[PDB]
RNA sequence: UUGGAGAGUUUGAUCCUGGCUCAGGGUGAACGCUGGCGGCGUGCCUAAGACAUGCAAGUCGUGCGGGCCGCGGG
């Protein structure tokens with residue numbers, strides 16, 4: 001079936017009379033390596049539940065992302081509030097050029113060759129959301145002349 | 149169209165802002181520890197401070213008159 005990757009685990013904290021009491025946040029992308037990716041954020045009182053909870057939501061938030069010989073059809077920039085991802089198509093023999101967060105998303109979508117660059121807040125979460133919305137806005141020639 | 153990776157650190161925790169710091173590459177280098185050979189580079193970045201000694205620009209007797217020495221006789 002699909003394939004999972006844990007980009008982010010982190011411990012948060014709330015306060016009460018007595019001290020700090022913790023939660024856990026799991027940021028996990030799930031892909032098909034052939035054009036299906038999803039991103040999910042799952043928060044739970046212990047690490048396994050969250051890691052498992054996020055993979056659930058991930059499977060219910062997928063994007064088409066239409067590959068073209070392993071690369072995306074056009075350059076794209078998306079801002080998710082102070083976070084900014086740039087994606088540029090790249091020829092075959094180049095590789096996936098991305099930091100760890102967008103890499104896990106592109107590599108699970110079957111992107112084999114792309115140029116990326118994060119800008120502004122490189123906050124992993126918001127960068128991950130902005131990478132997903134970037135893929136969500138990918139158009140093809142058949143997509144655009146149908147629109148026109 | 150051959151080209152673009154980020155991370156640590158302000159909070160109990162969050163998002164943002166922002167500075168500091170790090171991973172890379174480079175040097176006519178220097179310093180420490182260590183040191184086998186070969187090739188090709190390359191070596192006063194400071195006092196354009198001061199310098200012993202030798203050498204780094206001479207050559208033509210097919211321009212000219214001469215002193216010397218050596219070779220053939222007058």
Ligand SMILES: [Mg+2]
Nearest residue numbers: 064066138143
């Ligand atoms: Mg499409």
Ligand SMILES: [Mg+2]
Nearest residue numbers: 079081082083
């Ligand atoms: Mg902005």
Ligand SMILES: [Mg+2]
Nearest residue numbers: 081082083126
């Ligand atoms: Mg942001």
Ligand SMILES: [Mg+2]
Nearest residue numbers: 119120121122
């Ligand atoms: Mg910043």
Ligand SMILES: [Mg+2]
Nearest residue numbers: 121122123156
């Ligand atoms: Mg940061």
Ligand SMILES: [Mg+2]
Nearest residue numbers: 156157158159
């Ligand atoms: Mg500190």
Ligand SMILES: [Mg+2]
Nearest residue numbers: 158159165166
């Ligand atoms: Mg403060």
Ligand SMILES: [Mg+2]
Nearest residue numbers: 158159160161
């Ligand atoms: Mg602290």
Ligand SMILES: [Mg+2]
Nearest residue numbers: 156157166167
């Ligand atoms: Mg910073």
Ligand SMILES: [Mg+2]
Nearest residue numbers: 183184185186
């Ligand atoms: Mg020897």
Ligand SMILES: [Mg+2]
Nearest residue numbers: 192193194196
């Ligand atoms: Mg000098």
Ligand SMILES: [Mg+2]
Nearest residue numbers: 192195197198
């Ligand atoms: Mg000197």
Ligand SMILES: [Mg+2]
Nearest residue numbers: 194195197198
């Ligand atoms: Mg002086």
Ligand SMILES: [Mg+2]
Nearest residue numbers: 202203204205
């Ligand atoms: Mg001489």
Ligand SMILES: [Mg+2]
Nearest residue numbers: 207208209212
């Ligand atoms: Mg002479």
